[PDB]
Design an enzyme around this catalytic site. Structure first.
Site, mmCIF file in Angstrom:
data_model
loop_
_atom_site.group_PDB
_atom_site.id
_atom_site.type_symbol
_atom_site.label_atom_id
_atom_site.label_comp_id
_atom_site.label_asym_id
_atom_site.label_seq_id
_atom_site.Cartn_x
_atom_site.Cartn_y
_atom_site.Cartn_z
ATOM 1 N N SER A 1 42.560 45.393 39.484
ATOM 2 C CA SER A 1 42.797 44.320 40.833
ATOM 3 C C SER A 1 41.936 43.142 40.620
ATOM 4 O O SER A 1 41.949 42.254 39.811
ATOM 5 C CB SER A 1 42.541 45.356 42.013
ATOM 6 N N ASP B 1 54.037 47.582 43.982
ATOM 7 C CA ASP B 1 52.610 47.009 44.049
ATOM 8 C C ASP B 1 52.948 45.433 44.424
ATOM 9 O O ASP B 1 53.643 45.001 43.525
ATOM 10 C CB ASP B 1 51.635 47.115 42.763
ATOM 11 N N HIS C 1 49.443 50.127 43.800
ATOM 12 C CA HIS C 1 48.166 49.457 43.465
ATOM 13 C C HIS C 1 47.127 50.723 43.665
ATOM 14 O O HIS C 1 46.875 51.325 44.657
ATOM 15 C CB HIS C 1 47.898 48.555 44.535
#
Length: 298
Positions: A148, A242, A272
């Site tokens: 991320s 995502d 995600h």
């Protein structure tokens, strides 16, 4: 492709001050670790002197050392949440499955620190690891990694490495944020309801960037960089559902076309964050992907 069944059930069962929001994030990570405990692993805490101050680290030592480069891991959390503890479940498994020493980094969070402070810290820690590596019996070239926002950091550190005289053997990007300028189809179409949402990303940007213009800076949006030649071999893992999928996959394509050895793996039906969510078997599959990729590095 359909949502993964376990992901579908997780999303169905989902339901502050900054301090409170950070605590809530940590509590969620704790709960996931209670449901699926991490492997035991030897660790050592320490602090690295960076150009922006002391940065806490945790070194993970595998039961059996099998990989000849240290990993330096930057946790996710939108630049605002997370710490070495939130990401211990992922890092412990990386360490033991790859058989690698891993340095997990507690870089300064926003909004207290703003862009590009953590970028600098993350470079400094990687430089430290490269200098220490021979005394761990390892090669000086490091592998950077992150999920991320941590994948953003890994990507940026990788783009800056040559200029920073930082030897990097590979980059492992787990559903990274890479382009804060452009909307992509995934960003439009999976903007709400898949754990990472548009409103949150906006807010994260508000915390981390100094001004709106910072979105176009390449240390915030590494996908904007026009020359990707010579960058470190890249593993780019994305999740099908995502918002950040498409910028991740596009960056992988761009790396590949720039002659960077690149492995691009989309986990179908996933969301995600799945590599810190050990209720999903795909988390361990992705860790196996990491091990397989790194076997090819030397």
């Amino acid at each position: 492709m359909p949502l993964d069944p376990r992901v579908e059930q997780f999303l169905a069962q989902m339901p502050l001050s900054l301090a409170e929001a950070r605590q809530q994030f940590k509590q969620g990570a704790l709960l996931l670790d209670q449901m699926v405990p991490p492997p035991p692993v030897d660790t050592e805490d320490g602090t690295v002197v960076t150009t922006h101050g002391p940065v806490r680290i945790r070194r993970y030592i595998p039961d059996r050392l099998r990989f000849s480069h240290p990993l330096v891991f930057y946790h996710g959390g939108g630049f605002v949440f997370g710490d070495i503890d939130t990401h211990h479940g992922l890092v412990a498994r990386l360490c033991q499955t790859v058989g690698a020493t891993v340095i997990s980094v507690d870089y300064s969070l926003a909004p207290e620190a703003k862009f590009p402070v953590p970028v600098a810290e993350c470079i400094d820690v990687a430089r430290w690891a490269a200098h220490e590596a021979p005394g761990w019996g390892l090669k000086p070239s490091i592998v950077v990694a992150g999920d991320s926002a941590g994948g953003n950091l890994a990507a940026v550190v990788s783009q800056r490495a040559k200029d920073e005289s930082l030897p990097i053997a590979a980059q492992l990007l787990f559903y990274p944020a890479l382009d804060m300028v452009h909307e992509t189809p995934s960003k439009r179409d999976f903007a709400r309801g898949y754990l990472l949402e548009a409103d949150a990303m906006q807010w994260f940007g508000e915390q981390y960037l100094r001004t709106p213009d910072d979105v176009s800076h390449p240390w915030a949006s590494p996908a904007l960089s026009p020359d990707l030649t010579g960058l470190p071999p890249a593993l780019v893992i994305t999740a099908e559902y995502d918002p950040l999928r498409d910028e991740g996959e596009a960056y992988a394509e761009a790396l590949r076309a720039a002659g960077v050895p690149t492995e691009q793996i989309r986990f179908d039906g996933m969301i995600h964050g799945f590599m810190t969510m050990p209720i999903f078997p795909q988390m361990e599959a992705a860790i196996e992907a990491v091990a397989r990729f790194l076997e090819r590095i030397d």
